[PDB]
Amino acid sequence: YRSKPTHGIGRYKHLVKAQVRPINLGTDYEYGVLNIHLIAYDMALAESYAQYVHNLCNHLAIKVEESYAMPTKTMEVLQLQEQGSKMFLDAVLTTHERVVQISGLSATFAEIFLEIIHSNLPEGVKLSVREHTEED
């Protein structure tokens, strides 16, 4: 009740909010909206490393926004046969892609981060850092 000392005790909605630019200042320099593309041939491997990345970010207080899978590209590899001169033979492969979006960074945290990411790189794992604009 407005007249009382206890007014607004139940007030909550400012606590829970239920209702993009990199900021470069040259001294406090926040470079955000960054895309981590983890691409590898093995399903389990890419998933495990994407997982490791995700968890690493959550522990480092680095804010992850979106973690999602990119469409798999199916490769058909045509190998030359020696007997028949121009004769082709085939083997089937698949390329798997995962994505982890981080919303903020600083110079020092970029430097630190990349060290850990590439140091812990598993075999047959291709890593990419890019900018938020991409077209699915």
DSSP code per residue over the chain: -TTSTTTTSS--TTSS------EE-SSSEE---EEEEEEES-HHHHHHHHHHHHHHHHHTTPPEEEEEEEEEEEEEEEEEPSSSSS-EEEEEEEEEEEEEEE----HHHHHHHHHHHHHTPPTTEEEEEEES----
Verify binding: residue 51, RNA, rule CB under 7 A. yes
- Minimum Å gap between C-beta 102 and another protein is 13
Question: Which residues, at least 6 apart from 114, have a Cβ–Cβ distance to it below 8 Å?
Answer: 129
Which residue's CB is nearer to RNA, number 29 or number 127? 127
Binding site residues, another protein, CB under 8 A: 2-9, 11-12, 14-17, 24-29, 31, 41-45, 47-49, 51-52, 59-61, 63, 69, 71-72, 77, 79-80, 91, 96, 105-108, 110-112, 114-131, 136
Q: Which is nearer to RNA, 29 or 109 (CB)?
A: 109
Tell me, residue by residue from 61 to 100, as one string, x for binding to RNA by CB under 7 A and - for no binding: ---x--xxx-------------------------------
Residues that bind RNA (CB under 7 A): 47, 50-51, 54-55, 58-59, 64, 67-69
